[PDB]
Structure 1
Amino acid sequence: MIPTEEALRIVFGVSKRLPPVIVSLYEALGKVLAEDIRAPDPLPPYPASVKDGYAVVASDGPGEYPVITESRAGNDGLGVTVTPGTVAYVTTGGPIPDGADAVVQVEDTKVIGDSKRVKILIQTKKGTDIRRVGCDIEKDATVLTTGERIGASEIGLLATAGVTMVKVYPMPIVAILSTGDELVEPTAGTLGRGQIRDSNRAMLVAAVMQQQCKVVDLGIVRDDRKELEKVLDEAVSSGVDIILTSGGVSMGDRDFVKPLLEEKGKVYFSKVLMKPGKPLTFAEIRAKPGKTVLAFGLPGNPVSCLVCFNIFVVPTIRQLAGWTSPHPLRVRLRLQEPIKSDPIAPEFHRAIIKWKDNDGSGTPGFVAESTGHQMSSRLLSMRSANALLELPATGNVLSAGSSVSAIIVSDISAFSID
């Protein structure tokens, strides 16, 4: 039995970033860049107006002037020189004609006569409301770097730089199976004696889908050593990067996941000091030429299964996908109610957290409510839980208002407000 901190260090040290691939612009969204991106031309590539108005010679000052050209885009005003005593109409983003050195916004002008004459109402300064060439992005500047995750603004920067095929780290492909003679499919209606619906598989498929990985659903496997070996061998040779099993890892006489992973590869650990999730097994299998496949023998209890996924599998998926910061967000928060910690193992207590203007202490902060009974068979304890409170193994009652560390397990930008 090892502490969670050691089990995580072992998984981190074994897990390796996947080889990079080339994907299309929209396939790059959510992925980590595997190359730097440099601007092939400046932004703007021409001196551009910041305003709708008139391009002027700043030293002319207020007065009435003829409008000698109009510039909105492309070749508008090409070959025209704005000289002292003239002006040109411009729209925001329009190229500034040669000779003009400032822009006066349309609100500081007045059209005169029934042609093309305008009264400039202010004294402007050279460079006003003009974006010089390369103002926003210089030619050859690095706009994105290796190791940077691609979000909507990074997609915008790739499109600005004319990059439509991108080198990125791919997401791992994950195989998932359930084990047990007591399981039936979730489509089952009336249950026979000693049967339950398989809930872990669909839960894990959804959890892997939220991590943006492809899923290989290998179904229900019975408590038969030869049958489980065949499905594991088929998963290892299929090209997946991670295999997730659940169940078949306790102390029963038909629990074959641990001995099969010891036979096929290297089991680094099979027991972790934590509440819930004690029988977690982690192994590295080499596929026959070749490549490595990581295997997590997740506990069968629905709570322990999801908690082990959230703590151990999520950072592994991220490390394989090239994240330089794969750890989950940990924050400090105040308890809204008393919680008894466990005397033996540190507990990952499920909670519903929210940011409050007053966290109970007079300053704003996160607060947590327990999801109720924490029994590992009670999947209702995971319902709505956006965090796991890290309770040390003291056995004491942590009073309401005391502070604890919490791992945030669901989209902090999708948090329901107080």
Structure 2
Amino acid sequence: PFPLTSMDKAFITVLEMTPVLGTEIINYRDGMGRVLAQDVYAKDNLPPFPASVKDGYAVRAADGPGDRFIIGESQAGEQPTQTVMPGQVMRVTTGAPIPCGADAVVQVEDTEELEVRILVQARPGQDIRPIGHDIKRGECVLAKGTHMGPSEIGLLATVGVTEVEVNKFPVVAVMSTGNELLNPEDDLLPGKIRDSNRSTLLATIQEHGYPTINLGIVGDNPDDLLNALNEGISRADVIITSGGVSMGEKDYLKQVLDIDLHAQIHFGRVFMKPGLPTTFATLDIDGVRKIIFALPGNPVSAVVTCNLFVVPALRKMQGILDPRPTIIKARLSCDVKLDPRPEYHRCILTWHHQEPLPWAQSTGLMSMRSANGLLMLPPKTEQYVELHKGEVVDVMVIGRL
């Protein structure tokens, strides 16, 4: 039917064929996870005024250690009105401006109040942030392509840039196909099981913070597939389906993608385990490219494939420059024979006491802890028939460490 594709090729194909979404203007407070489509320039210095590091006294460094008159305090929110003559100091708190005449700050611990003995040995500039110390006016504080987190949002806040142009987030629609599926809420009936993949996939893509659309269970037949796919297509950038048959002519999905939607199917089988029966297609509608994944019904396959193919694609749609996952070295916790197909196991990563590498414990097992990574086993070869506990292996990170 469809040729077996190498795992290397399936993955490359998915990234090339996946488009980058366009951009839109958002409020900084919604920047979490967004990629900047612009440079961001600072329009003021930070600090705008010379600012004390310590709670203490602003002093002249020519006056060395000695007894000094305290002329006043520098208030936090205000421009200092007095000026510092030799033999004088002004009380300062952290982040307060330095008055004219002072070139250094001395802590309280190296010492209304009239007079202060100053123990000193202070060098000019000491414990002061000069104007533009942290941020210089007009300089690029964040560059195009930057993938923002809480600090980046803080930076936008700092420099006054409360509206910013970022790539869009993919809207992702998910359905389950199969005549054997009932909703989780239903009681079992003869020959039938509950639909688990829909919830697992929606939760997975939710973890990355993209908006989703639940199309529900869909019957395994041309009429019902074409309706859901069309609805998915008009409402979403990505349409994901789980389950459905692919023996002979009952592959109503691949049949509907090709005949009815005139989509283009880049691969329909991939030499991997689990998830051999995976399909990836694109459909060019009105110049926009929508992307379509048909993952296998097997629940382990669904979550594995979603992570190997879908998330990277969504990361690209979202404007990330390298949407490929982080692969880390880890030490194998349990012996295992190799399959001829490259295999992928949901595993838990633990960094044990003082040990440089984390241990990857395959689930294949009642951990209190959600699966942390995908153990990437290699394919069988004559020099690697099996792998033993302790051996260094590649683990792909799939959620919070």
Does TM, normalized by the shorter one, top 0.5?
Answer: yes
Distance in 1, Cα, partners of 2:98 & 2:50? 6
- Residue among 23, 29, 51 paired with 1:48: 51
Distance in 1, Cα, partners of 2:379 & 2:84? 78
Q: Structure 1's 237 and 334: CA in aligned 2 closer, same or farther, altered over 3 A? A: same
Amino acid corresponding to residue 358 of structure 2 in structure 1: F
Distance in 1, Cα, partners of 2:359 & 2:63? 63
Decide whether the 8 Å contact of 2:19 with 2:289 is kept in 1.
no
How many Å apart are 1:17 and its aligned residue? Answer: 1.2
Distance in 1, Cα, partners of 2:101 & 2:131? 15
Distance in 2, Cα, partners of 1:334 & 1:140? 48
Quick check: 1:212 aligned with 2:214?
no
Q: Could you say which residue in structure 2 is the equivalent of 1:308? A: 305
Distance in 1, Cα, partners of 2:221 & 2:246? 15
Amino acid corresponding to residue 366 of structure 1 in structure 2: P
Q: Could you say what secondary structure the match of 1:411 adopts?
A: coil
Quick check: 1:323 aligned with 2:320?
yes
Distance in 1, Cα, partners of 2:394 & 2:54? 50
Decide whether the 8 Å contact of 1:76 with 1:95 is kept in 2.
yes
1:273-313 CA-partner distances (Å, limit 9, x unpaired): 001101111011123x4411000011111111111101000
Q: Could you say which residue in structure 2 is the equivalent of 1:271? A: 269
Distance in 1, Cα, partners of 2:68 & 2:347? 70
1:106-149 CA-partner distances (Å, limit 9, x unpaired): 1122xxxx872222222322111111111111111211111111
1:379-404 CA-partner distances (Å, limit 9, x unpaired): x99x8332222222217221222222
Q: Could you say which residue in structure 2 is the equivalent of 1:200? A: 197
How many Å apart are 1:168 and its aligned residue? Answer: 1.1
Distance in 1, Cα, partners of 2:134 & 2:364? 53
Distance in 2, Cα, partners of 1:352 & 1:48? 48
- Taking the TM superposition and a 5 Å limit, the aligned residue runs for 1:11-410 are 11-78=14-81, 80-109=82-111, 116-189=114-187, 191-238=188-235, 240-251=236-247, 253-263=249-259, 264=261, 265-287=263-285, 289-342=286-339, 344-357=340-353, 364-372=356-364, 384-394=370-380, 396-410=385-399
Distance in 2, Cα, partners of 1:274 & 1:249? 18
The more displaced of 385-394 and 265-274 is 385-394
Amino acid corresponding to residue 347 of structure 1 in structure 2: E
Q: Could you say what secondary structure the match of 2:29 adopts?
A: coil
Distance in 2, Cα, partners of 1:77 & 1:405? 60
How many Å apart are 1:346 and its aligned residue? Answer: 1.3
Q: Structure 1's 46 and 393: CA in aligned 2 closer, same or farther, altered over 3 A? A: same
Amino acid corresponding to residue 46 of structure 1 in structure 2: F
Q: Could you say what secondary structure the match of 1:35 adopts?
A: coil
How many percent of aligned residue pairs carry the same amino acid? 46
The more displaced of 256-265 and 35-44 is 256-265
Distance in 1, Cα, partners of 2:225 & 2:150? 43
1:76-111 CA-partner distances (Å, limit 9, x unpaired): 422x221112211111111111111111111122xx
Moved over 6 A (4+): none
How many Å apart are 1:353 and its aligned residue? Answer: 2.3
Distance in 1, Cα, partners of 2:106 & 2:195? 70
Distance in 1, Cα, partners of 2:395 & 2:326? 8
Distance in 2, Cα, partners of 1:192 & 1:301? 19
Amino acid corresponding to residue 53 of structure 2 in structure 1: V
How many Å apart are 1:329 and its aligned residue? Answer: 1.3
Distance in 1, Cα, partners of 2:178 & 2:396? 31
Distance in 1, Cα, partners of 2:302 & 2:249? 20
Q: Could you say which residue in structure 2 is the equivalent of 1:8? A: 11
Distance in 2, Cα, partners of 1:328 & 1:183? 32
1:188-234 CA-partner distances (Å, limit 9, x unpaired): 13x11011111111111101101111111001111121111121112
The more displaced of 150-159 and 119-128 is 119-128
1:4-29 CA-partner distances (Å, limit 9, x unpaired): 11011111111121111111111111
How many Å apart are 1:64 and its aligned residue? Answer: 2.0
TM-score normalised by structure 1 residue count: 0.89
Distance in 1, Cα, partners of 2:18 & 2:244? 24
Q: Where do 5+ consecutive residues of structure 1 fail to align?
A: 374-379, 413-418
Distance in 2, Cα, partners of 1:146 & 1:321? 13
Decide whether the 8 Å contact of 1:357 with 1:365 is kept in 2.
no
Q: Could you say what secondary structure the match of 2:254 adopts?
A: helix
What is the total number of aligned residue pairs between the two structures?
392
